[PDB]
Amino acid sequence: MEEKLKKSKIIFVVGGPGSGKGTQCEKIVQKYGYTHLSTGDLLRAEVSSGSARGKMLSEIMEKGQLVPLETVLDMLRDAMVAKVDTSKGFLIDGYPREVKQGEEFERKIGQPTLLLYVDAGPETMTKRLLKRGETSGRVDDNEETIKKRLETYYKATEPVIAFYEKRGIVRKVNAEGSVDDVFSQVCTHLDTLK
């Protein structure tokens, strides 16, 4: 299972909050048939579970503490193994988030074959974020999250990108345009896969 994983096709999809990285991922899975994994999607399902894991998390969260990187990575390992005999590839949404977190993933799971960098400029993600707030009921008064979420991304995230191009695996998509025209670009990179 060490090797079966290491040879698996792993694509990190990294980009700012509101860059449109989920929708892209959902078109990849429809096209390509890859396995699409979001951390907050695992987190959510863990919680619902009622696992002993699902509960340590719930409770550290409700204290409003930050979830620990090894449990997140554990969670992710399990889910990749569980699909490894059957899957075409793994699609990993918003991850890493911190350079050392991309370090932990290669050690404990496997190397990424590709890093999909969904690049959108600031007003594009902010907008997309304003609209997504209405869409969910989020009463928010403040641009303290938009503003702050963005800031933290450029701060922690944009340095994953630099770590990555050293290895020659990053491929950037301009994320302005339709979902179809951004996806058009994704196809390009996805095509040279394997």
Curated annotation (Swiss-Prot):
Q: Which GO terms describe its cellular component?
A: cytoplasm
Region labeled LID — which residues?
Answer: 131-141
- For AMP, which residues are the binding ones? 39, 44, 65-67, 94-97, 101, 138, 149
- Kindly give the CDD domains that the UniProt entry links to this protein: ADK
Q: What is its EC number?
A: 2.7.4.3, 2.7.4.4, 2.7.4.6
Give the main location. Answer: cytoplasm
What cofactor does this one take? Mg(2+)
Q: How does activity depend on pH?
A: Optimum pH is 10.0 for ThTP synthesis.
Influence of temperature on activity: Optimum temperature is 37 degrees Celsius for ThTP synthesis.
Protein location: Cytoplasm
Residues with PTM N-acetylmethionine: 1
For this protein, the record's Gene3D superfamilies field holds:
P-loop containing nucleotide triphosphate hydrolases
List keywords of the entry alphabetically: Acetylation, ATP-binding, Cytoplasm, Kinase, Nucleotide-binding, Phosphoprotein, Transferase
Pfam families assigned: ADK (PF00406)
Is the Zinc keyword given for this protein?
A: no
Cite the GO molecular-function annotations of the record. Answer: adenylate kinase activity; ATP binding; deoxyadenylate kinase activity; nucleoside diphosphate kinase activity
Q: How does it assemble?
A: Monomer.
What HAMAP family does this protein map onto? Adenylate_kinase_Adk (MF_00235), Adenylate_kinase_AK1 (MF_03171)
Sum up the protein's function in the record's words.
Answer: Catalyzes the reversible transfer of the terminal phosphate group between ATP and AMP. Also displays broad nucleoside diphosphate kinase activity. Plays an important role in cellular energy homeostasis and in adenine nucleotide metabolism. Also catalyzes at a very low rate the synthesis of thiamine triphosphate (ThTP) from thiamine diphosphate (ThDP) and ADP.
Free-text comment about domains:
Consists of three domains, a large central CORE domain and two small peripheral domains, NMPbind and LID, which undergo movements during catalysis. The LID domain closes over the site of phosphoryl transfer upon ATP binding. Assembling and dissambling the active center during each catalytic cycle provides an effective means to prevent ATP hydrolysis.
The UniProt similarity line reads: Belongs to the adenylate kinase family. AK1 subfamily.
Its recorded name reads: Adenylate kinase isoenzyme 1
User: What is the originating organism of this protein?
Assistant: Sus scrofa (Pig)
